[PDB]
Design a protein around this ligand. Structure first.
Ligand code: YNO
Ligand code: CL
Ligand code: CL
Ligand code: CL
Ligand code: CL
Ligand code: CL
Ligand code: MG
Length: 138
């Protein structure tokens, strides 16, 4: 298994048609998972499944600019399960990140950070066994 937290460099940042694939298994008693697409210290796209926020499961997405979190976007559709293998795919589109989990569309997150070619790191962290993290063009 890969080390968590894991850094995946994104050389020259992201661009529309870039597909990022994360394979792993959720730990049995999970609390949270995070993907952080970073531009230096800023987080262009934070994707944060929470398994127990007020006894509900929710996806929180946000952006961090100058060390400050912005307005959260919430998705109540929650395809993860403690103990189970998952595939997260993040497809960069012109106006948004598109996320599919286990080959089913989950959400989109509109670009707040404009300089896509400076979003040069993906951090992966939280309650997972991480199998692989990769990217390709489509
Ligand atoms: C708890 O922190 C979380 C942040 N967070 C999660 C993680 C990690 N997850 C894993 Cl997995 C490993 S590390 N690190 N930072 C982030 O999810 C943020 C999204 O808006 O919400 C709160 S901070 C926050 C943001 C807003 Br807007 C309002 N209040 C608060 C607070 N407190
Ligand atoms: Cl590793
Ligand atoms: Cl920007
Ligand atoms: Cl760009
Ligand atoms: Cl970066
Ligand atoms: Cl790769
Ligand atoms: Mg540069």
């Amino acid at each position: 298994m890969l080390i968590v937290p894991y850094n995946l460099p994104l050389p020259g940042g992201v661009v529309p048609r870039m597909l990022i694939t994360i394979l792993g298994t959720v730990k049995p008693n999970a609390n949270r998972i995070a993907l952080d697409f970073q531009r230096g210290n800023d987080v262009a796209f934070h994707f944060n499944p929470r398994f127990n926020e007020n006894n509900r499961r929710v996806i929180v997405c946000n952006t961090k600019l100058d060390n400050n979190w912005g307005r959260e976007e919430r998705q109540s559709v929650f395809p993860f399960e403690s103990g189970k293998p998952f595939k997260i795919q993040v497809l960069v589109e012109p106006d948004h990140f598109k996320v599919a989990v286990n080959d089913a569309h989950l959400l989109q997150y509109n670009h707040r950070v404009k300089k896509l070619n400076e979003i040069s790191k993906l951090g992966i962290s939280g309650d997972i066994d991480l199998t692989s993290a990769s990217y390709t063009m489509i």
